[PDB]
Every structure is written in structure tokens, then in C-alpha cells.
Motif scaffolding. Structure first.
Motif, PDB file in Angstrom:
ATOM      1  N   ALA A  52      38.419  32.757  58.119  1.00 11.26           N
ATOM      2  CA  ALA A  52      37.943  34.148  57.893  1.00 11.26           C
ATOM      3  C   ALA A  52      38.774  34.783  56.817  1.00 11.26           C
ATOM      4  N   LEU A  53      39.850  34.235  56.343  1.00  9.42           N
ATOM      5  CA  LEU A  53      40.837  34.919  55.493  1.00  9.42           C
ATOM      6  C   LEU A  53      40.516  34.941  54.013  1.00  9.42           C
ATOM      7  N   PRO A  54      39.963  33.902  53.389  1.00  8.53           N
ATOM      8  CA  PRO A  54      39.906  33.961  51.941  1.00  8.53           C
ATOM      9  C   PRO A  54      39.040  35.127  51.389  1.00  8.53           C
ATOM     10  N   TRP A  55      37.994  35.522  52.111  1.00 12.87           N
ATOM     11  CA  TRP A  55      36.890  36.290  51.498  1.00 12.87           C
ATOM     12  C   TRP A  55      37.366  37.697  51.094  1.00 12.87           C
ATOM     13  N   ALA A  56      38.247  38.267  51.901  1.00 17.92           N
ATOM     14  CA  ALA A  56      38.770  39.592  51.602  1.00 17.92           C
ATOM     15  C   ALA A  56      39.704  39.612  50.422  1.00 17.92           C
ATOM     16  N   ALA A  57      40.073  38.462  49.892  1.00 25.03           N
ATOM     17  CA  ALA A  57      40.919  38.346  48.702  1.00 25.03           C
ATOM     18  C   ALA A  57      40.174  38.075  47.418  1.00 25.03           C
ATOM     19  N   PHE A  58      38.838  38.270  47.522  1.00 25.44           N
ATOM     20  CA  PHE A  58      38.001  38.310  46.312  1.00 25.44           C
ATOM     21  C   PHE A  58      37.444  39.738  46.122  1.00 25.44           C
ATOM     22  N   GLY A  59      38.286  40.746  46.339  1.00 27.94           N
ATOM     23  CA  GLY A  59      37.944  42.169  46.269  1.00 27.94           C
ATOM     24  C   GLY A  59      37.937  42.747  44.855  1.00 27.94           C
ATOM     25  N   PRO A  60      37.720  44.047  44.712  1.00 33.88           N
ATOM     26  CA  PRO A  60      37.707  44.749  43.429  1.00 33.88           C
ATOM     27  C   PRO A  60      38.796  44.310  42.467  1.00 33.88           C
ATOM     28  N   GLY A  61      38.484  43.960  41.240  1.00 32.17           N
ATOM     29  CA  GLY A  61      39.471  43.719  40.228  1.00 32.17           C
ATOM     30  C   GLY A  61      40.313  42.493  40.492  1.00 32.17           C
ATOM     31  N   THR A  62      39.942  41.617  41.424  1.00 31.48           N
ATOM     32  CA  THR A  62      40.816  40.474  41.712  1.00 31.48           C
ATOM     33  C   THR A  62      40.372  39.198  40.988  1.00 31.48           C
ATOM     34  N   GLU A  63      39.717  39.363  39.864  1.00 33.17           N
ATOM     35  CA  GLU A  63      39.318  38.170  39.094  1.00 33.17           C
ATOM     36  C   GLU A  63      40.462  37.255  38.656  1.00 33.17           C
ATOM     37  N   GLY A  64      40.346  35.929  38.455  1.00 32.12           N
ATOM     38  CA  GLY A  64      41.451  35.080  38.083  1.00 32.12           C
ATOM     39  C   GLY A  64      41.400  33.761  38.805  1.00 32.12           C
ATOM     40  N   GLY A  65      42.419  33.010  38.699  1.00 37.09           N
ATOM     41  CA  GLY A  65      42.497  31.636  39.143  1.00 37.09           C
ATOM     42  C   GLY A  65      41.252  30.882  38.716  1.00 37.09           C
ATOM     43  N   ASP A  66      40.857  30.003  39.655  1.00 41.79           N
ATOM     44  CA  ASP A  66      39.714  29.151  39.444  1.00 41.79           C
ATOM     45  C   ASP A  66      38.479  29.746  40.066  1.00 41.79           C
ATOM     46  N   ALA A  67      38.525  30.983  40.457  1.00 39.51           N
ATOM     47  CA  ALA A  67      37.274  31.645  40.819  1.00 39.51           C
ATOM     48  C   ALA A  67      36.384  31.743  39.590  1.00 39.51           C
ATOM     49  N   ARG A  68      35.115  31.398  39.721  1.00 39.00           N
ATOM     50  CA  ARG A  68      34.092  31.659  38.725  1.00 39.00           C
ATOM     51  C   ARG A  68      33.700  33.126  38.785  1.00 39.00           C
ATOM     52  N   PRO A  69      33.409  33.684  37.609  1.00 41.41           N
ATOM     53  CA  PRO A  69      33.029  35.087  37.599  1.00 41.41           C
ATOM     54  C   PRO A  69      31.759  35.330  38.380  1.00 41.41           C
ATOM     55  N   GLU A  70      30.921  34.282  38.542  1.00 39.69           N
ATOM     56  CA  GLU A  70      29.693  34.474  39.287  1.00 39.69           C
ATOM     57  C   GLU A  70      29.953  34.964  40.702  1.00 39.69           C
ATOM     58  N   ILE A  71      31.151  34.802  41.247  1.00 40.33           N
ATOM     59  CA  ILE A  71      31.442  35.330  42.581  1.00 40.33           C
ATOM     60  C   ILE A  71      31.122  36.818  42.681  1.00 40.33           C
ATOM     61  N   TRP A  72      31.501  37.671  41.723  1.00 38.71           N
ATOM     62  CA  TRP A  72      31.434  39.145  41.905  1.00 38.71           C
ATOM     63  C   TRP A  72      30.089  39.735  41.536  1.00 38.71           C
ATOM     64  N   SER A  73      29.485  39.167  40.493  1.00 37.60           N
ATOM     65  CA  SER A  73      28.202  39.702  40.071  1.00 37.60           C
ATOM     66  C   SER A  73      26.998  39.332  40.901  1.00 37.60           C
ATOM     67  N   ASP A  74      27.075  38.322  41.700  1.00 36.94           N
ATOM     68  CA  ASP A  74      26.121  37.875  42.660  1.00 36.94           C
ATOM     69  C   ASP A  74      26.751  38.037  44.050  1.00 36.94           C
ATOM     70  N   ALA A  75      27.168  39.231  44.418  1.00 36.88           N
ATOM     71  CA  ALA A  75      27.919  39.473  45.654  1.00 36.88           C
ATOM     72  C   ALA A  75      27.180  38.988  46.880  1.00 36.88           C
ATOM     73  N   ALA A  76      25.873  39.127  46.938  1.00 34.35           N
ATOM     74  CA  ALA A  76      25.097  38.680  48.089  1.00 34.35           C
ATOM     75  C   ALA A  76      24.955  37.182  48.168  1.00 34.35           C
ATOM     76  N   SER A  77      24.756  36.477  47.049  1.00 35.13           N
ATOM     77  CA  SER A  77      24.724  35.055  47.221  1.00 35.13           C
ATOM     78  C   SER A  77      26.077  34.483  47.615  1.00 35.13           C
ATOM     79  N   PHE A  78      27.167  35.001  47.072  1.00 34.12           N
ATOM     80  CA  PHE A  78      28.496  34.481  47.498  1.00 34.12           C
ATOM     81  C   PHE A  78      28.695  34.789  48.956  1.00 34.12           C
ATOM     82  N   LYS A  79      28.369  35.982  49.421  1.00 29.70           N
ATOM     83  CA  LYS A  79      28.496  36.386  50.823  1.00 29.70           C
ATOM     84  C   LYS A  79      27.679  35.466  51.706  1.00 29.70           C
ATOM     85  N   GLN A  80      26.408  35.251  51.348  1.00 34.79           N
ATOM     86  CA  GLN A  80      25.595  34.319  52.147  1.00 34.79           C
ATOM     87  C   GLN A  80      26.402  33.031  52.352  1.00 34.79           C
TER      88      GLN A  80
END
Ligand code: HEC
Ligand code: HEC
Lengths: 125, 125
Positions: free
Chosen positions: A53-81
């Protein structure tokens, strides 16, 4: 809880490290190469439940970086699904472990693993 | 569960990272600079409880490295006393959070923090 975006990145990557250890250490059990002790696996899956349950809350506002793809934030509902379905799969793994059912554990383990991979394939650089 | 000592080191350092976040994010609450929501803090301390038990099993046979001091393995009982007392302090923090008692939380938080520091001062390079 992160003073800088770098702190969110460090957090989610460490959550990922601990999940990989608590998930992957069961491979030999699922494969039968290590013995199955129902109590041991029930406790381990409880740890994995908490971590999952822990990782998801660490992809919050302005937390872009590492190996996260930017598609995580702009498609918030598909990442959440995808995280919600991963944790669904974790509930199923909990149920198998809590039941002490190895057959059921094997199947549920494979489903979890597929969920991990599906999200990484879409969302991890 | 570690294929190489390096894997134990990575694990315990990530456990430490997550503990620091779950512990440190409560500083503003303990100081009164952020509001106190008893339910929020009860859940967070439950996370911290789970994490607090994780590092110790990653200082096992042959897992020397990182910033662990070698004194960890050769004085197995003194290091154990220190992790067991740290987790005692965690039980006390759980009790304060579960009670919804802020005064009690403040005191218990300081005790936990002192325990972290005491072990690092002795055992972390
Ligand atoms: C999306 C819903 C994900 C699911 C499900 C899982 N992971 Fe993940 N993981 C995800 C992202 C977007 C990232 C990159 C984060 C970053 O900012 O770099 C990760 C990363 C990891 C890592 C690497 C951590 C590191 O060393 O940098 C690991 C080891 C990892 N993930 C493991 C893991 C496992 C075992 C999962 C299922 C049990 C799992 N992840 C699910 C996104 C998502
Ligand atoms: C001994 C009983 C410890 C207690 C209690 C706590 N920590 Fe710890 N910590 C300990 C060691 C020996 C090490 C070094 C591990 C290594 O192999 O390098 C650590 C490390 C950390 C770290 C740094 C992780 C990193 O980035 O490399 C952190 C952030 C950390 N510890 C935090 C932490 C907190 C917040 C604690 C109390 C809640 C705590 N530790 C207790 C030994 C011990």
C-alpha cells in the motif's frame, strides 16, 4: 511528507526494494524447492500487504523523477486502476496464505507477479 | 532471503529509509506545527510498527557491509538488546497513538527517537 521531490523518489524506490524482497523470497516455496510452512508464509504476506500500500502516495504533486515515466501523472486514472488492481491481487494472495492453501498461493503469487510487471512495463522507464 | 551480502545491505538500508520517513513525518505533529488527527497518526504508527521489525533479520550470517559497524555481529547480545528495546519503545508509541493521547505521543516519540540515535551512535559508521 517529502521535503523535496527527491525524497519521494527515494521513498518509493525503497518501498519497491522491500516489496521485491518480500515477494521474491517466496519463489522457492511456490516452486516447491523450499518447504511450505503455512504460518511463515502467512506472516510474510502480512508484511507484503503492508508494504504494497506504500508506494502510491509517493507519486504525489511535483514528485516527478527517478525511473517513473511521466505518463504516471497525466493519466492519473489509468495508473490508479493499475495500483488498485495490484492491491486486489495482494488481497487474493493474503486470502490464500491466510487459508494455508499452497495451490491457491501458487496461483495468487503468479497473479501478483503479473500485476507488478504490467505496471512496470507501462510506467517504469 | 538474500542471494549476496549486498542484497541484505540494500534491504536494511531501504528499511531504514522508510522508517525515517514514517517516524520523521510526525515531527510537525508532535511539535504542534501540524494538526493532530488521532486516526491518521494511529494508522501511520501501525505502518511504523511493521517496518520497525524488519531491519534486524537483514544483519544475518555473512551480511557484513554498508555502514554497519562490525561490532554488530561480534557483540550479538548487546546489538539485540538495543533492537529489542527500540521495538519496546515502538510498542509504547503504538499504545499512545492507539489511545489517541497526544501528550503521551509526544513523550513516546522522543523515546523512540533516542533509541534510534543510541543504536546509530554505537553501531553505524
Ligand atoms: C504500478 C501500479 C506499479 C506496481 C503494481 C508495482 N510497481 Fe514497482 N515500480 C513502479 C514504478 C513507477 C517504479 C519506479 C519508481 C521510481 O521513481 O524510480 C517502480 C520501481 C520498482 C523497483 C525498483 C526500485 C529501485 O531500485 O529503484 C522495484 C524493485 C519494484 N518496483 C518492485 C515491485 C514489485 C516486486 C512489485 C509487485 C509486488 C511492484 N514493484 C509493483 C510501479 C509499480
Ligand atoms: C540498531 C538497533 C538500530 C536502531 C534501533 C535503528 N537503526 Fe537505523 N541503522 C542501523 C544500522 C546499523 C544502520 C546501517 C545499515 C547499513 O548496512 O548501512 C542503520 C541505517 C539507517 C539509515 C540509513 C539508510 C541508508 O540510507 O543507508 C536510516 C535512515 C536509519 N537507519 C533510520 C532509522 C530510524 C529512523 C530509526 C528509529 C525509528 C532507526 N534507524 C533505528 C541501526 C539501527
Amino acid at each position: 511528507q517529502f521535503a523535496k521531490p527527491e525524497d519521494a523518489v527515494k521513498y518509493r524506490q525503497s518501498a519497491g526494494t522491500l516489496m521485491a524482497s518480500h515477494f521474491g523470497r517466496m519463489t522457492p516455496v511456490v516452486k516447491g524447492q523450499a518447504p511450505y510452512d503455512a504460518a511463515q508464509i502467512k506472516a510474510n504476506v502480512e508484511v507484503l500487504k503492508t508494504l504494497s500500500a506504500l508506494p502510491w502516495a509517493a507519486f504525489g504533486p511535483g514528485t516527478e523523477g527517478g525511473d517513473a515515466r511521466p505518463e504516471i501523472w497525466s493519466d492519473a486514472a489509468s495508473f490508479k486502476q493499475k495500483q488498485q488492481a495490484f492491491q486486489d491481487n495482494i488481497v487474493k494472495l493474503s486470502a490464500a496464505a491466510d487459508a494455508g492453501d499452497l495451490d491457491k498461493l501458487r496461483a495468487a503469487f503468479g497473479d501478483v507477479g503479473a500485476s507488478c510487471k504490467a505496471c512496470h512495463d507501462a510506467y517504469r522507464k
